[PDB]
Amino acid sequence: SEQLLRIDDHDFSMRPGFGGPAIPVGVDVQVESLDSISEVDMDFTMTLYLRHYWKDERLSFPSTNNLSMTFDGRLVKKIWVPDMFFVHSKRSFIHDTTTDNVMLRVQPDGKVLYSLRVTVTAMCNMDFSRFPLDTQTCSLEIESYAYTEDDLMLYWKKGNDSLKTDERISLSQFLIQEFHTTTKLAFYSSTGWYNRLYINFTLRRHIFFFLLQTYFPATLMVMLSWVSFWIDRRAVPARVPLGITTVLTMSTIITGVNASMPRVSYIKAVDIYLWVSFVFVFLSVLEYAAVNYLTTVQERKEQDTHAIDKYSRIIFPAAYILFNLIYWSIFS
Amino acid sequence: SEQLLRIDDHDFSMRPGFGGPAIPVGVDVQVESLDSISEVDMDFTMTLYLRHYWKDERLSFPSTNNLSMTFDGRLVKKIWVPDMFFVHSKRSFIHDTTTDNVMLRVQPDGKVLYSLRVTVTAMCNMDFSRFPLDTQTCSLEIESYAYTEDDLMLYWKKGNDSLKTDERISLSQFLIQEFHTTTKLAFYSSTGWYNRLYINFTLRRHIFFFLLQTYFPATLMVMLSWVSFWIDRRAVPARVPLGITTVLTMSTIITGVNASMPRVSYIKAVDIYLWVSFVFVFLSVLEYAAVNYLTTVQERKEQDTHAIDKYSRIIFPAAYILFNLIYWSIFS
Amino acid sequence: SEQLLRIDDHDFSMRPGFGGPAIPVGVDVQVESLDSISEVDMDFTMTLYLRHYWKDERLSFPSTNNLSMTFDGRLVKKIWVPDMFFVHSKRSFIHDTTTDNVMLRVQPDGKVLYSLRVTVTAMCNMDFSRFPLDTQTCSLEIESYAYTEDDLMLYWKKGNDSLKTDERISLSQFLIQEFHTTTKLAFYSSTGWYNRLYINFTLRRHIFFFLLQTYFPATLMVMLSWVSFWIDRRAVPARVPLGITTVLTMSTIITGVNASMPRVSYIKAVDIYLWVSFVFVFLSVLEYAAVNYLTTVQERKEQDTHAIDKYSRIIFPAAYILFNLIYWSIFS
Amino acid sequence: SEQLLRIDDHDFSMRPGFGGPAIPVGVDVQVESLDSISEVDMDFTMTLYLRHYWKDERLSFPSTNNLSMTFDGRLVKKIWVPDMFFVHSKRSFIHDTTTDNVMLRVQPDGKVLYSLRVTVTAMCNMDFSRFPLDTQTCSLEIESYAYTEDDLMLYWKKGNDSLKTDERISLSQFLIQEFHTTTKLAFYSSTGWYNRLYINFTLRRHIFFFLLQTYFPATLMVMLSWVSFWIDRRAVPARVPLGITTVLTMSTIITGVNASMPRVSYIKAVDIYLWVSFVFVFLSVLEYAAVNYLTTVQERKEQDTHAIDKYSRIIFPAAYILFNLIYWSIFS
Amino acid sequence: SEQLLRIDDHDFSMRPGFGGPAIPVGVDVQVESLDSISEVDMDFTMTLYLRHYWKDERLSFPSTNNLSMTFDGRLVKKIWVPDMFFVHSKRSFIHDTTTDNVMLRVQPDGKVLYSLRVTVTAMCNMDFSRFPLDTQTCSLEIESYAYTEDDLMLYWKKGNDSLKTDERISLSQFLIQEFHTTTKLAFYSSTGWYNRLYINFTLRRHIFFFLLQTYFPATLMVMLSWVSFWIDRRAVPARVPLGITTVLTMSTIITGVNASMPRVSYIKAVDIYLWVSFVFVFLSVLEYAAVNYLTTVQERKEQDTHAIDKYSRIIFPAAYILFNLIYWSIFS
Ligand SMILES: CCCCCCCC
Ligand SMILES: CCCCCCCC
Ligand SMILES: CCCCCCCC
Ligand SMILES: CCCCCCCC
Ligand SMILES: CCCCCCCC
Ligand SMILES: CCCCCCCC
Ligand SMILES: CCCCCCCC
Ligand SMILES: CCCCCCCC
Ligand SMILES: CCCCCCCC
Ligand SMILES: CCCCCCCC
Ligand SMILES: CCCCCCCC
Ligand SMILES: CCCCCCCC
Ligand SMILES: CCCCCCCC
Ligand SMILES: CCCCCCCC
Ligand SMILES: CCCCCCCC
Ligand SMILES: CCCCCCCC
Ligand SMILES: CCCCCCCC
Ligand SMILES: CCCCCCCC
Ligand SMILES: CCCCCCCC
Ligand SMILES: CCCCCCCC
Ligand SMILES: NC[C@H](O)CC(=O)O
Ligand SMILES: NC[C@H](O)CC(=O)O
Ligand SMILES: NC[C@H](O)CC(=O)O
Ligand SMILES: NC[C@H](O)CC(=O)O
Ligand SMILES: NC[C@H](O)CC(=O)O
Ligand SMILES: CCCCCC
Ligand SMILES: CCCCCC
Ligand SMILES: CCCCCC
Ligand SMILES: CCCCCC
Ligand SMILES: CCCCCC
Ligand SMILES: CCCCCC
Ligand SMILES: [Cl-]
């Protein structure tokens, strides 16, 4: 094998066909798993198989079998091999247990297949201002490092059919949909033009979990705060603790929701809901102070429900309804 | 030794017997420990010994002893060795202190034994919708990377007896049961067919700890909320703070249970329990407002227990009982 | 190629032109992304491309094409290459998947271009005493390790135009502004003088998020504490729980704000706001004790609003206003 | 030196004396520090020096000095060296700054000394059911990987005197006592018999810190709940809030103790204490409801302390005392 | 250069002058930064430059220039170099981007200078029983690994002037003071005597931040608890909730201070303060129960301030004052 190929009779720092046109190289990918997601750092981790095809007649051998052979890794450092890399990546590695996950098959003609197994972490810019009703889209990019479109030609081996995805892929916090591929040509100011391949996909959440954990308790709190309009205004020590305890409860809920968020420092769509229900509860406590002050001054002036109570009984819910209509018209 | 074997007289990039049938290779495993589990990331970590057997007559030597020899590691890179790898793995390594944990024994015939010590992290898809009453099953998969069933034949060396497990294995959060092995043939669209080996096992939790920490306090809270049906309706400042303080207490408990969960964003079987006891406590606070409003309007109209109290005393517990029956009929 | 260049006919431990003047070396940078920031550890992480230019006539070759060639990495360890390093850095590495991200281009003259892809973590001293109204500025420094200004001359290749920045750069907690470059000469007491290059930039926060999360609820709490001046002093069991519950609420808010801060142990500008509103709420609770004690002793002496109430109704808000004026005159 | 020893005249893949009996190899250890402990993962980290002694007459040299020489590391890969490894370990490494921490001394006879500096993480099964009154014992195990008791003989160089421990060893959460060594012979089903060395030690906690942080506040809460037996039963709005606020306080304490525990999911000895004091506080709130209901029905029937109060004043503390006696008789 | 020095004509496994006396080697250090501190693990991280000087006439070359040359790294593995290491260290490394941060300068005589750039984590035993009023001192130790005082002599190159410290060094949680150096001779029982160098320094905190965050709110709580001595004893429903709410508030504060401490399990000087103010608040709640019980029994016996109130008004503060005097006499 090491003899079948005239390894010492050629020069492999030289791309196959240095001189005239660019070498065609064709790519095939199969995704094994998506491993983790960070919302704070804005990135994701994926593990896949990567395959390459090309022809190099320096590697042809005399056999009659019309069938391929096999090598692994050691030969990659003797021969010439392409040099793809992952664009917009934070870290990556190739697996090496119990030996290097690298495969090499060569036919009599010198046609070649070359394959690896890798894990990549790759950046994805996200926007959380519609949280928890956001949708995100991410991508993985592949490019040649050293050779430009004048020396190497990059393309998907079988067009739209060059991506395969494993059956058992899932996340404990997301739903994954819409895998597909595309291409684009890209330019560097000090080095030139290159071809680039993409893999795209889309993410969404489970909205009912967030509904019950956040929107439901605050609504029950705002509804608890309307009870005070139906209690006798003469019962001061039963109308005064109620409001302030309700404020305490709502502040506890809001604090509890703040101590578990992914810690991204700009205003999002649930913060608005929570702070508006805080303001409603606060107004309910101003109301009864108005009523008490007026009843007391009347008592002093002289020496039945109050108008403000029987008006609040109507006004407060209608305005909560009006707020909910507008809010869900804006975030749908 | 390096001379006993004609190392320079052979070619080891070539599998033993390149040409005709596939080489038989036989595997034996002993598990040392399970090291950690992640429920958020859905994976586990294990450490084991791995052993291989095969015959290669390029390694035979003239001795009369009918007994094996020993080498370690350096020789592995001179001779031909198989290339197994762990399928659906996130990371792994071989231990190297104070030197490489690799052993090699060769007999006069050229029969070989080869062994390593490794640690692997490996994915396991879990479903937590029955939490804390869930059960999970995981597995470790082993496969050849480079050679197909037409070049290498993978099998357990002794059938069902090829797995051994250490005596002192345990986790601080789980109970481990049912180790066994099996096999399956698997297919890759761009490379072909391979043999694969499995090791399976099962996990369960301690249910009484979760019972006392979560289900018990909420039940005592719902039972505390029924006390208010037996207090005099004329005692407004002693019936009004009770309910709202009880709501405060229950919200504190629920928040405390949310700040320690493994953070998996979909609805699970304990969330339902907690939110239904929240709704019961909320209804208890609506009840006394009904009673107060009615007594007040009667006082105004004119100028003994109330029916609603003596009806609630019966209705509320029966419905809690009915909820518990249905809930534990569904989750058993 | 390895032959075109007389590799074995020269000595590369020797800088080009050892002897007379210093070699000119010129630098070009393109920033890909800012990856993370730590406020506790005072540092940041960046990923970029780095490019070098120089001439070495040991690498010239006879060709007529007036056009460059290509190599990658392996050649870097055969020839002489500069040795820049990142000053005030905690950690860094060069990417190596699927091979080393290193490029090398040589023209017939022996002019050279050399480029890498790296990730660096680099220290930045920050001062948080104006938090959340702070502004920070950071920088990345580049220097030669081994050769002084008498052997190597470091400069930007194109002056102000030698820095390029990617379009899609962002952080989930900051706004980035004002990239520019400069230079400075620097001195080591036991080794001598060197040239150094800088890249500078500036950071700011989103102030409205911090406003709503911190300053707003405490203000509503201080305003809730003024309600007690308008309730009848004869209603002791409705004036005594109010203050103490309000104290409870404010302490809960402050504790909630302390359990999420970046944990830097010196006094900052929001702590002052929070503790002054604590002191206001505390004084409101001392006030009514004064009023109760005086009314009781008058009752005992003998056997209408009180002056202190109708004075507090004016004094407390004016002093809160006066505090806000001074505070926002100091932090603007 | 490299010449003094006839390196190229011998074969070092071959243990000294391959053939007849087993080589004696003798071990000496000095512990530098214990570095960290994990209670969740059940393991510890230690750093030490390790020393070996043996004789190999392939390394003898003609000198008259009767005194040893020195080498470092590079020679270890030319000559034959033993292959010990740490049994039941999760990770380890040898230090390499500013070069490899390896020492080698050889005398004229061929006697050898060989030493390293390493850090190891090693598993320790713990049982926390007596927490905070638990005691744990851990150990570090040392074994040959490749050679059995028929090829290598492992023993402590000086018996009980072969372990030394540094003066300045401590943990910020434990007290360390009782270092000693021992040996045992161990068996592998597919490879055979080996010798193994042990180092053992013991751990304990500071019990008074846990006492004040956990047992003290709950006791004061249970004692606060007995005050309600001495207040007038006619004071409903002063007897009804007291109990429920006390329940709130105790639930806050318990939640605070749950949010800081090492997160091991089975019942431990402090959980029992906390939940029994919860049940006592709950019964105190049922008591006054009994008293109120009875007084009210008597008032209705007709139209002085109550017996239940003056009985509870005696019964509740005695039963708390009886619980404490039994509890501290069981956990001592 | 590689020729100027007769590399192949000498033996470098042999220290310069093997035989007679010990080689003098002299050390110079410059500290770049202190990077982080762990109070739980008791250690710190530092980054510095390290320099060595010695003479070796195997490296002399014929030149007339009386001036030094330069090499980098590759030569270190051809020639003989010392072998210093950091004593009591947990981890360390040498920086290698964009190449190895190693410098080598040789003069015609064979005098040598050798320098590196490293980061070290190093243990420091701390005692927190005076927290937050503690002071700590730490050190970094440097020693030869392989050679004893009979083969190598270690000393500071310029005495007290051999340490330089960067201008821009700081921590976000500490103040750093008092850098200085010293030396000591040290002994190993199985290997012998060595020289060791030290760098020492001192740390302190910001005490006013801890004062406002911890001591201030508890004091205001103890002062709030004295208000109850001035309210009318006839106002039961206004004297009974006050105490218990105050207890709730103080327990919340203490829990909040426990959920952010560096988690070191022994009693410290702030714990005492907090638990004594807890006991004061608890006694204030026992007091009014005494007063109520006595007034009630007098009412029953028959059918103005109470003595206990007008005595407590004096006794409680004086004892708080007396506690503060003693406490701050003990911790100063
Ligand atoms: C499935 C639970 C839905 C809760 C909706 C609450 C809207 C305020
Ligand atoms: C919001 C509570 C209103 C209760 C009205 C009851 C009328 C029967
Ligand atoms: C960007 C608008 C924020 C509005 C916040 C309102 C809070 C009551
Ligand atoms: C928000 C309710 C206002 C009610 C005003 C009533 C004036 C008589
Ligand atoms: C062993 C404790 C069981 C608690 C059961 C509580 C069910 C509500
Ligand atoms: C739920 C408390 C009921 C108390 C009834 C007592 C009858 C003696
Ligand atoms: C998927 C059904 C959720 C029901 C939640 C009910 C909460 C009261
Ligand atoms: C859920 C209790 C309802 C009671 C209704 C009573 C109507 C008289
Ligand atoms: C957009 C919200 C602003 C809130 C300002 C609060 C100032 C106390
Ligand atoms: C701070 C509340 C004052 C209420 C006054 C109402 C006058 C109509
Ligand atoms: C450095 C001045 C701090 C002032 C704190 C005041 C808290 C009421
Ligand atoms: C801070 C308010 C003081 C009011 C004093 C009134 C004296 C009659
Ligand atoms: C040193 C404090 C001891 C506290 C004991 C509390 C027992 C309930
Ligand atoms: C294993 C016995 C648990 C008992 C728990 C009792 C809680 C009141
Ligand atoms: C636990 C106290 C029970 C008291 C019963 C009294 C019956 C008259
Ligand atoms: C600068 C604030 C000092 C606070 C001292 C509090 C002492 C109890
Ligand atoms: C601790 C509050 C005492 C108030 C006394 C007021 C005397 C005018
Ligand atoms: C070591 C003495 C501890 C004293 C604790 C006192 C708590 C009230
Ligand atoms: C538990 C408080 C009892 C108080 C009794 C006081 C008798 C003088
Ligand atoms: C701690 C205050 C004690 C007061 C005792 C008064 C006895 C008449
Ligand atoms: N295709 C990668 C670029 O050529 C690298 C660079 O920007 O230098
Ligand atoms: N058995 C592993 C596969 O052959 C690797 C790949 O998918 O290329
Ligand atoms: N330019 C880096 C310095 O020369 C290194 C050192 O301080 O020794
Ligand atoms: N002594 C280590 C064992 O021989 C390794 C294995 O189990 O194969
Ligand atoms: N100076 C380091 C010691 O010689 C190493 C050891 O203890 O063996
Ligand atoms: C917040 C409600 C105020 C009503 C004044 C009449
Ligand atoms: C929630 C109970 C309402 C009862 C109305 C009669
Ligand atoms: C804190 C207010 C005190 C007023 C005394 C007249
Ligand atoms: C929980 C105490 C009940 C007493 C009934 C007489
Ligand atoms: C705790 C104070 C008790 C006073 C008894 C007279
Ligand atoms: C009324 C006496 C108060 C004393 C405070 C020290
Ligand atoms: Cl009342």
- HEC-encoded secondary structure of A226-246: HHHHHCCCCCHHHHHHHHHHH
SS (H, E, C) chain D: CCCCCCHHHCCCCCCCCCCCCCEEEEEEEEEEEEEEEECCCCEEEEEEEEEEEEECHHHCCCCCCCCCCCECCHHHHCCCCCCEEEECEEEEEECCCCCCCEEEEECCCCEEEEEEEEEEEEECCCCCCCCCCCCEEEEEEEEECCCCCCCEEEEECCHHHCEEECCCCCCCCCEEEEEEEEEEEEEECCCEEEEEEEEEEEEECCHHHHHHHHHHHHHHHHHHHHHHHHCCCCCHHHHHHHHHHHHHHHHHHHHHHHCCCCCCCCCCHHHHHHHHHHHHHHHHHHHHHHHHHHHHHHHHHHCCCCHHHHHHHHHHHHHHHHHHHHHHHHHC
**DSSP annotation string for E151-175:** TEEEEETTGGGSEEE-TT---SS-E
Cα–Cα dist C26/D259, whole Å: 57
Asked if the peptide bond before residue A108 counts as cis, ω within 30 degrees of 0, the response is no
Cα–Cα dist B229/A273, whole Å: 35
Residue having the nearest C-alpha atom to atom 6 of ligand 12: C308
Q: Which helix (H) or strand (E) holds E238?
A: helix E236-258
Task: Please report residues of E whose CB lies closer than 8 A to that of C255.
Answer: 252-253, 256
Which 8-state DSSP code applies to residue E115?
E
Tokens linked to C9: 């006919």
Cβ contact, residue pair D249, E244, below 8 Å: yes
Residue E143 in marked binding region: yes
In this structure, are residues C43 and C124 in contact, taking their beta carbons and an 8 Å threshold? Answer: yes
Cα–Cα dist C329/E112, whole Å: 61
Task: Please report residues of C whose CB lies closer than 8 A to that of E61.
Answer: none
Instruction: Give the one of E92, E251, E267 whose C-beta lies nearest to D209's C-beta.
Output: E267
Kindly identify which residue of chain B lies nearest to residue D235, measuring between CA atoms. B238
Using CA of residue C210, residue C211, residue C212, residue C218, what is the dihedral sign?
positive
Binding site membership of C254 for ligand 11 (Cβ less than 6 Å): no
For residue A165, which phi and psi values (nearest 5 degrees)? Answer: -135, 135
Contacts of D276 (CB under 8 A, 6+ apart): D323
State the burial class of residue E314 (Cβ atoms within 10 Å of its Cβ: 0-12, 13-18, 19+). Answer: exposed
Cα–Cα dist E199/E124, whole Å: 13
Measuring CA to CA, how many Å separate E56 from each of B184, B332, C287, D69? 66, 82, 85, 20
In this structure, are residues D197 and D142 in contact, taking their beta carbons and an 8 Å threshold? Answer: yes
Cα–Cα dist A226/A230, whole Å: 8
Q: Is E239 helix (H, G, I), strand (E, B) or coil?
A: helix
SS (H, E, C) chain C: CCCCCCHHHCCCCCCCCCCCCCEEEEEEEEEEEEEEEECCCCEEEEEEEEEEEEECHHHCCCCCCCCCCCECCHHHHCCCCCCEEEECEEEEEECCCCCCCEEEEECCCCEEEEEEEEEEEEECCCCCCCCCCCCEEEEEEEEECCCCCCCEEEEECCHHHCEEECCCCCCCCCEEEEEEEEEEEEEECCCEEEEEEEEEEEEECCHHHHHHHHHHHHHHHHHHHHHHHHCCCCCHHHHHHHHHHHHHHHHHHHHHHHCCCCCCCCCCHHHHHHHHHHHHHHHHHHHHHHHHHHHHHHHHHHCCCCHHHHHHHHHHHHHHHHHHHHHHHHHC
Measuring CA to CA, how many Å separate C50 from each of A104, C85, C102, C113, C115? 33, 11, 10, 11, 6
Binding site membership of B328 for ligand 5 (Cβ less than 6 Å): no
Binding site membership of C149 for ligand 23 (Cβ less than 6 Å): no
Q: Tell which of E187, E231, E247 to mutate to test the D interface (max D CBs under 10 Å).
A: E247
Tokens linked to E29: 């250090």
Task: Please report residues of D whose CB lies closer than 8 A to that of B241.
Answer: 240-241, 244
CB under 5 Å of ion ligand 32: residues: A 237; B 237; C 237; D 237; E 237
Cβ contact, residue pair E98, C93, below 8 Å: no
After what residue numbers is chain C broken, C–N > 2.5 angstroms?
303
Cβ contact, residue pair A86, C97, below 8 Å: yes
Instruction: Give the one of D232, D235, D249 whose C-beta lies nearest to E251's C-beta.
Output: D249
Tokens linked to E129: 């029983």
Binding site membership of B275 for ligand 7 (Cβ less than 6 Å): yes
Q: Work out whether strand E23-38 and strand E163-165 pair parallel, antiparallel, or are unpaired.
A: parallel
Tokens linked to E72: 């980098």
Measured in angstroms, how far is the CA atom of residue C34 from the centroid of ligand 22? 35
Which 8-state DSSP code applies to residue E230?
G
**Top mutation candidate among A293, A294, A300 for ligand 10, by most atoms within 8 Å of CB:** A293
Instruction: Give the one of C39, C83, C147 whose C-beta lies nearest to E99's C-beta.
Output: C83
Residue E51 in marked binding region: yes
Measured in angstroms, how far is the CA atom of residue C214 from the centroid of ligand 9? 9
Measuring CA to CA, how many Å separate A309 from each of A105, A288, A299, A304? 85, 8, 18, 11
Binding site membership of D215 for ligand 13 (Cβ less than 6 Å): yes
A–B interface: beta-carbon pairs under 8 A: 144
Contacts of E329 (CB under 8 A, 6+ apart): none
**DSSP annotation string for B188-217:** ETTTEEEEEEEEEEEEE--HHHHIIIIIHH
Residue A190 in marked binding region: no
Measuring CA to CA, how many Å separate C164 from each of C30, C50, E81, E104? 5, 11, 43, 35
Cβ contact, residue pair D265, B220, below 8 Å: no
State which ligand 1 atom lies nearest to the alpha carbon of A218. Answer: 8
**Top mutation candidate among A188, A189, A195 for ligand 21, by most atoms within 8 Å of CB:** A188
Cα angle vertex E231, ends E225, E233, to 5°?
110
Cα–Cα dist C264/A61, whole Å: 68
Q: Tell which of C40, C63, C98 to mutate to test the A interface (max A CBs under 10 Å).
A: C98
Q: Tell which of D8, D85, D148 to mutate to test the B interface (max B CBs under 10 Å).
A: D85
